[PDB]
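Weekly sync, protein design subgroup
Attendees: M.S., D.O., the rotation student, P.L. (late)

Item 1: inverse folding check
M.S. brought a backbone from last month's batch and wanted to see whether the design step gives back something sensible before we order anything. D.O. pointed out we never logged the input encoding, so this time it goes straight into the notes. Structure tokens as presented (272 positions):
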């Protein structure tokens, strides 16, 4: 009839589905703030597995460890722009790499929720935690247009051109809500940080160059929304939507590292 929820109980959930998104790897002129270089790294439809464990030691407190990982290499894309001419608003260089692999992607998130409002149908509270997210790509082959289109050509097919990975880590705060009627349950989380630490590594294999960038104190917004049905008092089948935005050798004013991503998964949660 309704969910069976005991004190000091805990849940385990697993879901499966898809990751998409877009990262930007940026280079600015530290003197003028003018954008010099931008590579757009896409994640097209990577298969992922998500796990979630919750424990309610008290009626007002939940402890939560969750995370996801790509299951294998996935489909991506990369576009690389330079603005080599200050006297021009349009980029002078564009290289395209449709054959870009997403080598891996993962995330984990350790947190607590403190429930401030609670009744028969509604729960609302504050959350805080620590989260890290990682992405890795390799762009291969592709084509290049340089000097406003006067140099054009192709990279050797299948050959690695640029390797790139990002890591975002942050403590965060947020608001958590729940709505239940009968056997339907809706959860919504909103997360925020002004304390994001970003790192990336870029290997330009054909230039014998490696770039490292690091930023600090950038902004993050995220949401987790899941809607489910208890097929039994202890077992919930659910769909989950997720959205994350990490705002923006190489340091300080020169560096820019960002990402947007979303996940759509479905699975099962069980309460012990």
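Designed sequence read out in the meeting:
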């Amino acid at each position: 009839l309704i969910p069976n929820i005991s004190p000091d109980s805990f849940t385990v959930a697993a879901s499966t589905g898809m990751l998409s998104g877009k990262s930007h790897e940026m280079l600015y002129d530290a003197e003028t703030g003018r954008k010099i270089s931008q590579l757009d790294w896409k994640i097209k439809n990577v298969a992922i597995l998500k796990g979630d464990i919750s424990w309610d030691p008290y009626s007002f407190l939940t402890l939560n460890a969750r995370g996801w990982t790509s299951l294998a290499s996935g489909s991506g894309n990369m576009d690389d722009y330079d603005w080599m001419n200050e006297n021009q608003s349009e980029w002078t260089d564009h290289s395209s790499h449709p054959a870009t692999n997403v080598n891996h992607a993962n995330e984990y998130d350790l947190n607590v929720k403190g429930w401030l409002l609670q009744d028969e149908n509604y729960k609302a509270g504050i959350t805080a935690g620590y989260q890290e997210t990682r992405f890795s790509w390799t762009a291969t082959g592709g084509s290049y247009s340089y000097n406003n289109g006067a140099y054009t050509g192709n990279f050797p097919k299948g050959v690695r051109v640029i390797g790139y990975n990002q890591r975002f880590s942050m403590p965060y705060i947020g608001l958590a809500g729940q709505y239940r009627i009968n056997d339907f349950e809706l959860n919504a989380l909103f997360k925020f940080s002004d304390w994001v630490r970003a790192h990336d590594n870029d290997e330009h294999y054909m230039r014998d160059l490696t770039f490292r960038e690091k930023t600090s104190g950038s902004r993050y917004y995220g949401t987790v929304i899941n809607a489910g049905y208890y097929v039994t008092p202890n077992a919930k089948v659910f769909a989950e939507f997720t959205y994350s935005k990490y705002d923006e050798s190489i340091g300080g004013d020169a560096a820019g590292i960002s990402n947007k991503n979303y996940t759509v998964t479905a699975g099962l949660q069980y309460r012990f």
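Discussion: The chain has one domain: 1-272. The two ends are 17 Å apart (CA to CA).
Action: P.L. to compare against the previous round before Friday.
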